[PDB]
Structure formats: C-alpha cells, structure tokens
C-alpha cells in the first residue's frame, strides 16, 4: 500500500516540500495590475540581481524528470513555460526539444541559443504560441551547475530572450520518491563584477495547481511503473 503509486506520489511530494495552491493562492505575490506594472517597468535591465526566486510546478518538474531519466546518460534538453511575478520566476510547464544532441552545442557558440530561439519563434506567432520563461538540460551524474557553453548560451538568452532562466537537473540516484537534484541559474552581463563567477543560483520551490492533478496522476503512474521495472533500488 505504501509501496503503491499514490503513497509514492505523496512521499515524493513531501520530500520535495511542495505546496498545494491555486496558481496564485499565495503563489503570486503581486496582483494582476502590479504584475503588469512590473512587466512593463522591467526592473531587470537595471538590477542584475533582480530575480531571487524560482517556482516550478509539480507537472513541469515531473515531465522534466521523466525526460532526463528516459534519456539516460545522454544529456537531454528542453524548454520551460511560465510567468514572471516580481522577483520570482514561475514555471508552469516544460517540454522536450525534438532535437537531442551535443552538436547543437559543442560545434559553435550560439548554435544552441539559435535553435532555441527559432523553435520558440516558430512555436508562437503560429500554433499554441507560448511564453517561454527558460530552458533546461541534464547533467546525469555530474550534478547541477553551469558549463562554459551553458553560460554563453544563457547569456545570449538573457540578451535576446529576457526574462529567461537556465534550469539544470541531475536525475541519478535519489532513492525512489525523494528530493529532486535541480538548480536554476541566471548569468551576468559580460562586464559585471559585483565583488562583495559569471552566474548565480536562484532559490527553487515546488508547487502543484489544482488542475495539474489528473495529469499528475497519469504521469506519476507511468513514472512509478517504470521505476518498478528497474529495482532492487527500492529494497
């Protein structure tokens, strides 16, 4: 019973310190009006430390995790959707870039940011559109941080794609239902030396909307079933 899917979903929710909320229901700090005054004001572009916070939906987290896990020891890659509410960036959704490989990365500086921006460009202005609030890739066993290419890529993002964030994730290990290894990062412009590194880490929190729940259930189901197919991890 505690070995079943639901008790596992609950354990995993607990280890990750989630919240049950309304998308607001305290999630948003700011009311719609003052959300828009900030959106229009663009308090970043001036303060480089402006964004101190990142909040990720259970849904977007789970899909990312499953993506990173399915990809194995290959580094996988994807984008993320969401809204900026003040200094807090909110990721409502995530998904997988159709093109997996490191040649879009290692072979040139801007290659990855260009694929990213062209995909986005196409994925709005035509069907279903978006607002893309960042990108994510996996560091399967070397942990969560930014490589030189992560950093150059994220800098191009924070020039052209702003607001944008880079999410790194390391699916390996972590028990069965247990703390995700994740990080969310922003770069600094080419000059910046706020001298008390070219990037910094936001503070990540997890939450789940009330309409996430059935999807969350099917998804977590598949995820847990595939957990059971490789095991002696849960002993």
**Any idea what the Cα angle at residue 200 is, between residues 196 and 205, rounded to 5°?**
125
Q: With respect to Zn ion, which residue has the nearer C-beta, 23 or 147?
A: 147
DSSP code per residue over 57-115: EHHHHHHHHHHHHHTTTSPPEEEEEEEEETTEEEEEEEEE-S---SHHHHT-SSHHHHH
Q: Which does 150 bind (CB under 5 to 8 A by kind): Zn ion, its own copies, none?
A: Zn ion
Of 108, 222, 228, 231, the one binding its own copies by CB under 8 A? 222
Considering only residues 101-120, where is the footprint of Zn ion by CB under 5 A? none
225 near its own copies (CB under 8 A) = yes
DSSP 3-state of 218: helix
Query: Residue 37: which H helix or E strand, with range?
Result: helix 32-41
Tokens standing for 98? 């159709």
d(CA 222, CA 60): 15
Nearer to its own copies, 130 or 227 (CB): 130
150 lines the binding site for Zn ion (CB under 5 A): yes
Reduced to 3 states (helix: H, G, I; strand: E, B; else coil), residue 42 is coil
Stretch that binds its own copies, among 149-157, 180-188, 210-218, 227-235 (CB under 8 A): 210-218
- For its own copies, how many residues bind (rule: CB under 8 A)? 39
Interface with its own copies, residue 118, by CB under 8 A: yes
Closest C-alpha among 229, 221, 227, 192 to residue 9: 221
Q: Was 139 annotated as part of a binding site?
A: yes
* Residue 47 known to bind ligand: no
Residues forming the annotated binding site?
A: 137, 139, 150
What residues make contact with its own copies under the rule CB under 8 A?
A: 59, 63, 66-67, 81-83, 92-93, 95-96, 98-101, 103-104, 115, 118-119, 121-123, 125-132, 211-212, 214-215, 218-219, 222, 225
């Amino acid at each position: 019973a505690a070995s079943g899917s639901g008790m596992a979903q609950k354990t995993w929710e607990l280890a990750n310190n989630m919240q049950e909320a309304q998308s607001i229901d305290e999630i948003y700090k700011y009311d719609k009006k003052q959300q828009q005054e900030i959106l229009a004001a663009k308090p970043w572009t001036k303060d480089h430390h402006y964004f101190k916070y990142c909040k990720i939906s259970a849904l977007a987290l789970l899909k990312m995790v499953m993506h990173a896990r399915s990809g194995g020891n290959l580094e996988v890659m994807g984008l993320m959707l969401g809204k900026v509410d003040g200094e807090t960036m909110i990721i409502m959704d995530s998904f997988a870039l159709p093109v997996e490989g490191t040649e879009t990365r290692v072979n040139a500086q801007a290659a990855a940011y260009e694929y990213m921006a062209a995909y986005i460009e196409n994925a709005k202005q035509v069907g279903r559109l978006e607002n893309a609030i960042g990108w994510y890739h996996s560091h399967p066993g070397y942990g969560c941080w930014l490589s030189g290419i992560d950093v150059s890529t994220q800098m191009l993002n924070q020039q052209f794609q702003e607001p944008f964030v880079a999410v790194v994730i390391d699916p390996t290990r972590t028990i069965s239902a247990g703390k995700v290894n994740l990080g969310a990062f922003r770069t600094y412009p080419k000059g910046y030396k706020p001298p008390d590194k070219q990037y910094y880490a936001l503070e990540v929190s997890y939450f789940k909307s009330s309409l996430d729940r059935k999807l969350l259930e099917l998804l977590w189901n598949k995820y847990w079933v595939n957990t059971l197919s490789s095991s002696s991890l849960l002993t």
